[PDB]
Amino acid sequence: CPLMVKVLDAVRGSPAINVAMHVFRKAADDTWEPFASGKTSESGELHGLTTEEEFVEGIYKVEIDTKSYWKALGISPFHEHAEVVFTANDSGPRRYTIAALLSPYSYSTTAVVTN
Amino acid sequence: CPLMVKVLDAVRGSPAINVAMHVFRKAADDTWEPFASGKTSESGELHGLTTEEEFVEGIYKVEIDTKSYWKALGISPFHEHAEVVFTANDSGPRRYTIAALLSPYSYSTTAVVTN
Amino acid sequence: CPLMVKVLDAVRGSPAINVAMHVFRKAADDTWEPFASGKTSESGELHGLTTEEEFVEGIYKVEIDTKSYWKALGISPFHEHAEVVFTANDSGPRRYTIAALLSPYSYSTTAVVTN
Amino acid sequence: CPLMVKVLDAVRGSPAINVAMHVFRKAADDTWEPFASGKTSESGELHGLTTEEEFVEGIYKVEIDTKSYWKALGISPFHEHAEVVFTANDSGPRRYTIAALLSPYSYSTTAVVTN
Ligand SMILES: CC1(C)C=Cc2c(ccc3c2OC[C@@H](c2ccc(O)cc2O)C3)O1
Ligand SMILES: CC1(C)C=Cc2c(ccc3c2OC[C@@H](c2ccc(O)cc2O)C3)O1
């Protein structure tokens, strides 16, 4: 698939399991339209969000529900969520892997983009 | 100073200078209301965004224009911008330092919350 | 395998390919003994460093040659290398995944430990 | 102050206080020579490690006792310690800020190198 997200937990040293996230695409009228959504598996991965045909050129936002994740573990975290906003497929189709590391008061994200 | 942002550059090993950001507060209708804004100084710091009187409880969004930063350095960035979204003062007013570290395909942010 | 390392490049948004690393184990005399070594593949992964039988309880050090990596790309980085030092298998055999993200002046590492 | 270290805690959203570290300089025989040491203050900072006269070109290692830090908080950590190894002053004397962010299974460090 052309878009997948993997989430790790820096407190437990484990994948971050059952983490919900919503993907949006920027529309012509500059609003965010719902594009896809899912949650991470027991390996902390979310696959199959979209397809090569559906995943057209555009600006995308992945909003990761880190707050509910920490809350379910008894932690009151700093962030409401973690976002990743990027232009995709500008120079042709690419595959995107979004990696996120979660702590109660911190997060890191990086992107691996391949042809 | 109840809210301070500090931005570092992971490619050049320096403060990230002249980085523009806007701070929003979530309104009752769930849209983002402009609240404050500024550019990081030569030390990568942005101060005096708000005061303790004005900085009431609510959900705040700091949107950092990382894309313009990398473009000025002649480097192609992944993200459109970096966001930090958080609930402020849920236990009564505190002081917030938001630290962000920027790379072209990655960013890390952490909060320091003091009394 | 019980120990694998994956390395990403935060400047290129890609795996960090052909990154050399050496693993050492702490000996009885408190010296570092060579344990295994390898380099990352085109997916930025290094597998097959060791086996369940060989990978006994101990303190291990993974020393990642980040300097040569950046140098080969024309960058003079801050760090000589990135280390990860940890006690392994203290409560019984585990599988360790070491993830590292590289920038010229920064690095991040996290560990995923599973049974 | 030519060398300063600042440590943050990603679980508690605070400076990491009373974190002990030692700084070493590589000797001609490739062993690590004690050079300086201290504990982070209430602001997570450690200053006055060295002076511009004494801080000559060489390879320096800052070894941060992250393990003792987490143990005192009652939290099981992955790493034995965190290291930062770097060549200093290769273009003539500069000022170094080493920033480290600590989680139980992860750490991030970045350098700010100023003139
Ligand atoms: C989160 C990460 C990866 C590691 C620590 C870090 C950072 C970006 C910015 C800053 C960080 O910690 C130090 C902090 C800081 C710098 C100067 C200062 O005077 C006070 C501070 O609290 C700024 O990236
Ligand atoms: C620590 C930080 C900042 C955030 C997560 C991260 C990383 C560097 C490398 C990897 C990271 O998480 C995903 C991980 C990974 C990638 C592919 C895969 O198949 C399995 C994995 O565990 C690799 O940097």
Output the CA angle D45-B81-C14, nearest 5 degrees: 85
Q: Residue C59: beta bridge partners?
A: C87
Question: DSSP of C33-98, one letter per residue?
Answer: EEEEEEE--TTSEE--S--TTTS-SEEEEEEE-HHHHHHHTT---SEEEEEEEEEESBTB--EEEE
Q: Measured between CB atoms, which of C81, C103, C106 is closest to D85?
A: C81
Q: Where are the alpha helices (DSSP H) in A31-97?
A: 66-72
Give the pair of three-digit tokens for residue C35: 């344990």
- DSSP class of residue A70 equals H
Alpha-carbon A23 to chain mean position: 7
CB proximity A59 to B under 8 Å: yes
Other C-beta atoms closer than 10 Å to the C-beta of A56 total: 11
State the ligand closest to the CA atom of A110. Answer: 2
The neighbouring-strand residues paired with B14 are B9
d(CA B19, CA B23): 13
CA distance C23 to C55: 11
Do the chains contact at D101 and B111, CB–CB below 8 Å?
no
Q: What is the resolution of this structure in A?
A: 1.8
Of A10, A104, A105, the CB nearest to D106: A10
D70 backbone dihedrals φ, ψ, rounded to 5°: -65, -35
The 8 Å CB, 24+ separation contacts for D49-57 are D49/D1, D49/D3, D49/D4, D49/D5, D49/D23, D50/D2, D50/D3, D50/D23, D51/D2, D52/D2, D52/D93, D55/D2, D55/D3, D55/D88, D55/D89, D55/D93, D56/D88, D56/D89, D57/D87, D57/D88, D57/D89, D57/D90
Helix (H) or strand (E) segment spanning residue A14: strand A14-15
Q: Rounded to an integer, what distance in angstroms lies between the CA atom of residue D76 and that of residue D79? A: 9
- The reply to whether D14 touches chain B by the CB within 8 Å rule is yes
Q: Where do the domains of chain B lie, and which CATH numbers do they carry?
A: 1-115 (2.60.40.180)
Backbone angles phi, psi at D46, to 5 degrees: -130, 115
Token pair listed for C74: 């024309």
Please tell me the residue having the least CA distance from ligand 2 atom 4: A101
> What residue of D is the nearest CA neighbor of A104?
D11
- Would the annotation count D6 as a binding residue? yes
DSSP label at A90? B
Q: Is B25 in the pocket of ligand 1 (CB under 6 A)?
A: no
- Both tokens assigned to D63: 């070894």
| Shortest Cα–Cα distance, B43 to chain A (Å) | 22
Q: Is A110 helix (H, G, I), strand (E, B) or coil?
A: strand
Instruction: Please report, for residues A62, A108, B35, B59, D32, the alpha-carbon distance to residue A82 in angstroms, rounded to integers and kept in the order given.
Output: 8, 9, 21, 14, 41
Residue D52 in contact with partner chain A when CB distance is under 8 A: no
Question: CA-CA distance, D50 to D54, in Å (whole number)?
Answer: 6
Q: Which residue of B has its CA nearest to D13?
A: B112
Are A50 and A1 spatial neighbours (Cβ–Cβ below 8 Å)?
yes
Q: Which of C62, C66, C98 is nearest to C83 (CA)?
A: C62
Alpha carbons D111 and C12: distance in angstroms, whole number? 19
Residue identified by tokens 């995308």 is: A60
Burial of B115 (0-12, 13-18, 19+ CB in 10 A): exposed
Distance from CA of D98 to the nearest CA of B (A): 10
Contacts of A9 (CB under 8 A, 6+ apart): A15, A16, A44, A102, D105
